[PDB]
Amino acid sequence: SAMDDEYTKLLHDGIQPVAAIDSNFASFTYTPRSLPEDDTSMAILSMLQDMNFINNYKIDCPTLARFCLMVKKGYRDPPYHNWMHAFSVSHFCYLLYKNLELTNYLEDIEIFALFISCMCHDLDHRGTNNSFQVASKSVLAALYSSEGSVMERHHFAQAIAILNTHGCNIFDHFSRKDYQRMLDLMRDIILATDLAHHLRIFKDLQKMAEVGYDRNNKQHHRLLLCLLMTSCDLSDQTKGWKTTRKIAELIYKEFFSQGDLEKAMGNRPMEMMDREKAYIPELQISFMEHIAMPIYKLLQDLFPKAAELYERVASNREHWTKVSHKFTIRGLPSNNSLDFLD
Ligand SMILES: Cc1nc2ccc(C(=O)N[C@]34C[C@H]5C[C@H](C[C@H](C5)C3)C4)cc2n2c(-c3ccccc3Cl)nnc12
């Protein structure tokens, strides 16, 4: 069995120092997707160690090793919502910790919950969104459609299922107040990854940024966790052009695959899901203008050291504008043929 041997090394070999992973591993300029997938579970352990969670919370190391592997194995392989996404999201959480002084805003246990939630937040994603669950009358919709955020409720339930798996509950020694607290936080944070939810609370996020963060305000803690989570989720937009280009490719591969299924079901996909109608440059520009840039603007507003993240997203949006003309075919196509018009 592969996993048990991967577990045996991961447990008995020792945890690699984060600097050995990459000299810039803790920089906002580092691209975690550069790390070979076979190195990612070790890197998760390294980050947990470097953030001092393992020591602070006295996490059992066999339990933690099993948990991390179980979480990795809990992702399928659609083009975008796979383990490497969850890993890069978690890595960004680690970046926020190393670069922004979260401990001035958040309790230790909240920061811990944020990171674990990042690892788990898209568990068992099938490459389809919430509307598709209802449209296709999936089992997940049958469970959760009356509450909404179907996929995110499922991700959370899957995280819980992993914790409830023997030898995997990294929290089982917690006091009952802390155990209850961690699971409540995981619920809130994972549910916050539904963009419908972000869009609902965006004005509360603005109000908070405008009046200024109040560490004595429990609502401010909740709101900030939501914003940080979303910041991790979209953090591919904060790297270089190449990262944004590739991730747009993975995203639309996934979207158009869903759209193809919708057409087979006799439904009209959303424009952005329809490979015959979607114009990727304007769609990506819309996403960056209406969703990604405001999120990092808020992040910068709350954390002045996050300024570079916003300017990076803004710059990447500019690049989409600059390359948009390449989506128009000028001259003949590469094969010198107009056959494709037929
Ligand atoms: C690069 C990139 N583009 C993205 C373009 C579009 C959408 C997207 O779901 N847009 C919306 C647009 C309106 C209002 C809501 C609900 C629906 C209608 C669909 C959101 C997401 C995009 N996205 C994400 C991402 C983040 C969280 C969950 C799922 C995903 Cl896919 N991560 N990266 C990207």
Ligand SMILES: [Mg+2]
């Ligand atoms: Mg998700």
Ligand SMILES: [Zn+2]
């Ligand atoms: Zn995600």
